[PDB]
Every structure is written in C-alpha cells, then in structure tokens.
Write a protein that binds this ligand. Structure first.
Ligand code: QRF
Ligand code: QRF
Ligand code: CL
Lengths: 302, 296
C-alpha cells in the first residue's frame, strides 16, 4: 500500500556522470562507453549567448580545450563532434561502469527520473514528467546543465533527457540524447517563452485508478460520459484532450478496478466541477498528473 | 529554480542489496562488510533461530550465492555472517533518527532495487511509504559527504497502509512489534518545523502570497499548533531555521504568523510550490541542501 512519487534507483546513471569544462564554463557530461555527451552550449563564451554559431565555435576548439573529469581522474579527449545540440567528446577510456542503455525520445506526459548533478557529482534524484508544453518542472540551479533524465527497464537505462536551460518562468528545457530539443526551444539566450501548460489528463485518470487500487473510492459517481463530452468539459479546465489511445491505455487499470474508463472520466469531470471539499486523494489536495498508466501498474502491482 | 521531493542518489546503497530466502519467505538484506542484515521475521525468535542452520539461509547477491557462516539476532534484525566482504561496502554508519527527520528509501524486491523515494519519520513513528509484499528489508538512509547513514529497515505494513520498521540495530521506531497481529498507528500530527522550512523554500522560489506583516510569540503559536494537530515548535526548531530566516528576511515567528493564518483561513484556491496542502516532509536541512546544490 501507499503511493509515492518514486524515482528509479540512480546508481547506474551516477557511474556515468562526469564534469566537462571548456574555458570558464563547467557543466555535467554523461560518459557511456568511450563518449562523453554534454550540452553543446559548453563551448559558448559571454559573447555567444544570443546567436552562437556552434559549427564556427566548435571548429576553433582542440581536444585539449575540453577538460573532462571523472571522479578524481582527468580523461583524455581524443575527438569531438556535434550532433544537433549535443556535443560528443570521444575519450581514450571506455567507462567501466557503462550500464546496458538506450537513447529514447519521449512524448509529453511521459515520466522519468532526473539525477540532478553539479560539477559532475550527483546531488539528488527526483521524478519528473515531460509537460504538454515540452518543458519539465525540475529543480535545477546554475551548473546543473548536462544532468540527465532516464527510466530503467530490467537492467537497461533509457536516457530520455539532457538538461540545457531554465526559461523565465522557472521551468526547464532540454533535449533527448541525440541533441534534439523537446519543444520549440533553441540553445540561445534569446527570449523564449513556454507555451501555456495544460494538465496531462491520461495521467490524472491513471492516478485516480491508483487511488481506487489503494482503497479510496469517495470520488466515484454513478455516471458515465461520452469521450467527446468529457473532452469538451476537460478542455475548459485546461486539461489535455483524452484520445482513444489514452482510453485503450487505461484498459488494464479499468479491468483491474472494475471501473470503465468513461466512468472514471465522469468522476474526473465531477472533481473538476466540485473540487475535493476538504478531502484528499492519495495524500494530495490537487489532481496529480505526473504518474503515467505504466507508473501506476508498476508501483501498485510490480 | 524549482523544488522537488528529492531523494539522495541511491548507488551506494544499491551495491549493498541482496536477497535473503529462508524456507518459503524471500525478502531483502543489506550486505555491509561480511554481514547481511535483514528483518528477523524471515525466520519466539530465539527458539525459531536455534533450529536453523547456516545453509537454511540462501543469500543471493546479484547472480552469486553467498555462503552464510554464522547467524545472530540483534533486537528485531537478523545478522547473517557471510564468507565474503561486500567489495562495494560504502563508508557507513548506523544512525537512529527522530520523528520529523527525512530519509531516502530504496524500495527493493528479490534483492533488486526498484525505486527510490524521499519520506519522513512521522511523529507517530510510521512512514507513509510505498511498499508491496516482498519489500521487507528495504532500507532508508541519508548521505553526508561520502558516508551513508542507514536509519531504517522495513518490516511491515499497518492496516491504514502506512509502514513500520526499525533502525539497523533492530529497534522499532514506534510502539510496534514484529508479530502477525493487528496493530494500529497512533493519531498522526504535522511536523511544524518542516512546514516552516517548506514555506521558506517557497519564498526562496518566489512564492510570497502567504507572507504577512505580523509576528507572534512562540507560546501563542504553540497554542494554535496544538489546536490544528501540529507538533509543538521548540526554541531548537527556531534556532535551526535561523539560516533560512536570515536568507529570506522573514523571522521564524513572522513565518509562524503566516502559518497560523494559513491554518485558520486555508489557501483560498491558491497553491504553494504546486501543493494545495502544507507539506511537512522537507526538513530545514533538506531546504538548504536543495536550494544550494550540495553533491555526493
Ligand atoms: O539556463 C541556463 C543557461 C542557459 C542556457 C541556454 Cl542554451 C539558454 C539560456 N537561455 C534560456 C532562454 N532565456 C530566456 O528566455 C530568458 C530569461 C530571461 C528572459 O528571457 C535566456 C537564457 C540559458 N542555465 C541554468 C539551467 N538550469 C537552471 C538554472 C538556474 C539558474 C541559473 C541558470 C540555470
Ligand atoms: O507487513 C508485512 C508482513 C508482516 C510482518 C510483520 Cl513483522 C508483521 C505483520 N503484521 C503485523 C502488522 N499488521 C497489521 O497491523 C495489519 C495489517 C492488516 C491488518 O493488520 C500486519 C500483520 C506483517 N509485509 C509487507 C510489508 N510492506 C508492505 C506490504 C504490502 C502488502 C502485503 C505485505 C506487506
Ligand atoms: Cl514516451
């Protein structure tokens, strides 16, 4: 019993964190096999904030300009290349602690663990979700760039995010491990605004199923809804549209609890209308949207 | 910016988790040096233990079976001596924590780490954990520099879905016993010093709507705290929050006046750090560590 915002154990990623220094800038790098991955903005000077030409800045660098530190050992950079917004520093030593891993690009609503790092050293681990506006609500200070987001399945680490920047609203933007930004963001200090964020409806429904599995039913009602009427209502509270894919995805939790998806949708519509009336659901007075259907099944069933 | 429920990096503890099987029961063990610690309920415990041989305890560390060469009990923990010291043993201490203190839990099943989450020792000595059958022996810890302070070992789940366990010396937190008998968690209260720390975290992150011009006395605040099932705030708590008070410019009794108003009037549709409830599972130290980026 119980339901917590649970992160993956971070050890497999901790053994990959290194410090990358280029000039006056120091940030984190991810050392997998003989490559260190990090944000390409590590090559920017104070004059390359707004409109850096990374190809031009990179061509001027030598391998010995990149100082890479793995624990108390300086690694030797023997090559460098850029892939989209990530810099790949070839090193002369393969990381002996390289886990089984994959690079995966995630979709909005997906969750992942973040291992926040400073100076190549892990500081903490927390659970995140890719918001519908492609930002993440992380906890990051200056120096956290290059910290990564990941999931673990079996003994395989799926790296899905690399931290690049904080937007004016305190939310965070980054890329996958192929250097492609999530969202319409660029690794320039030109003014960029996150689009209006919305609630991840499918995740709220998953969390209501988690509540039912854990013994709570107070929010259930005798009603159902059509998918279209639900979306018309949900949109008025800035909830993401619920698609037939989301309904299908909720099938297993529906079968386990005996509450049809559209019946849970009617419960959600009522909660949006009434609020909680001093009650909580799984220790929260707000509807939680950073647990996916897959997270609920994993945490509640194994 | 941002403020998350953040756990310590778990790698140092992951390299200590092993599976312990005794008869039909399988649970987790903590392998430090040449000893595996686990709940004694894996087995009148003295009478049940005397009947066991070393080979009855099957200990698996990854894909390797360890050899048990001795067994002894310390309070509610069983100590299985093994023939091999754990090469991954970190620098560690066993520490007993107090209610209100937080720690990270590395939830494990079959000796394999499944997740990590941060929680607090409730004033009623339970933890609002997230555990399924097979999670016994999972541990709670804090990290200071490179030293792991192990403070909790999971033993059981109470009827309300909350959890009970011991320190690593086998002493239960709370008035619980390791017997398959209905036991109830006492009425819980809110960890006041932690709520104040989290309000300071909100101020540091730009959430100031709940601030007010008022201050209060420690005694008047505690009278209001008692009324709302909040733990008493001591002068030690006030002193502990001193750094956050100096950083934000909000004296602890000034934050207490903000807290009193929140308790008597509610949030009025507003939130603080993304919560519509007052969060009490961040200590003043947690706030300073997170809002300053300390590493391990
Ligand atoms: O965010 C950067 C550095 C950084 C990298 C890159 Cl690739 C881009 C940019 N920009 C992003 C977009 N932009 C704006 O939209 C803006 C701010 C004010 C008005 O407009 C300007 C800066 C900033 N670092 C840091 C990463 N994470 C947490 C930090 C918490 C404190 C301080 C820094 C942190
Ligand atoms: O709680 C035990 C096993 C266990 C160990 C020991 Cl030392 C004692 C006891 N009991 C004494 C405490 N008690 C109650 O007060 C209670 C619950 C329901 C009715 O009464 C439960 C029986 C149970 N395991 C598990 C650990 N964590 C999560 C689990 C989630 C599902 C199932 C089991 C889990
Ligand atoms: Cl995805």
């Amino acid at each position: 019993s119980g339901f917590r915002k649970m992160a993956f154990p971070s050890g497999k990623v901790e053994g990959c964190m290194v410090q990358v220094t280029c000039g006056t800038t120091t940030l984190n790098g991810l050392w997998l096999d003989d490559v260190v991955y990090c944000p390409r903005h590590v090559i920017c000077t104070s004059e390359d904030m707004l409109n850096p030409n990374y190809e031009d800045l990179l061509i001027r660098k030598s391998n010995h300009n990149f100082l890479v530190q793995a624990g108390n050992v300086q690694l030797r950079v023997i090559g460098h290349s850029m892939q989209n917004c990530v810099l790949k520093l070839k090193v002369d030593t393969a990381n002996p602690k390289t886990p089984k891993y994959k690079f995966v690009r995630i979709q909005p609503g997906q969750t992942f663990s973040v291992l926040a790092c400073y100076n190549g050293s892990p500081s903490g681990v927390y659970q995140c979700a890719m918001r519908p506006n492609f930002t993440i609500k992380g906890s990051f200070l200056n120096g956290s760039c290059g910290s990564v987001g990941f999931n673990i399945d079996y003994d395989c680490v799926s790296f899905c995010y690399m931290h690049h920047m904080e937007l004016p609203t305190g939310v965070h933007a980054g890329t996958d491990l192929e250097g492609n930004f999530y969202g319409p963001f660029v690794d320039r200090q030109t003014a960029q605004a996150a689009g209006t964020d919305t609630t991840i409806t499918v995740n709220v429904l998953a969390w209501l199923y988690a509540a039912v599995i854990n013994g709570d039913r107070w929010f259930l009602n005798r009603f159902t809804t059509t998918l279209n009427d639900f979306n018309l209502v949900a949109m008025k509270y800035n909830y993401e549209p619920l698609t037939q894919d989301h309904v299908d995805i909720l099938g297993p939790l529906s079968a386990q609890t005996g509450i049809a998806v559209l019946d849970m949708c009617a419960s959600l519509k009522e909660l949006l209308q009434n609020g909680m009336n001093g009650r909580t659901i799984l220790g929260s007075a707000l509807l939680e949207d950073e647990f996916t259907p897959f997270d609920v099944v994993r945490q509640c069933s194994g």
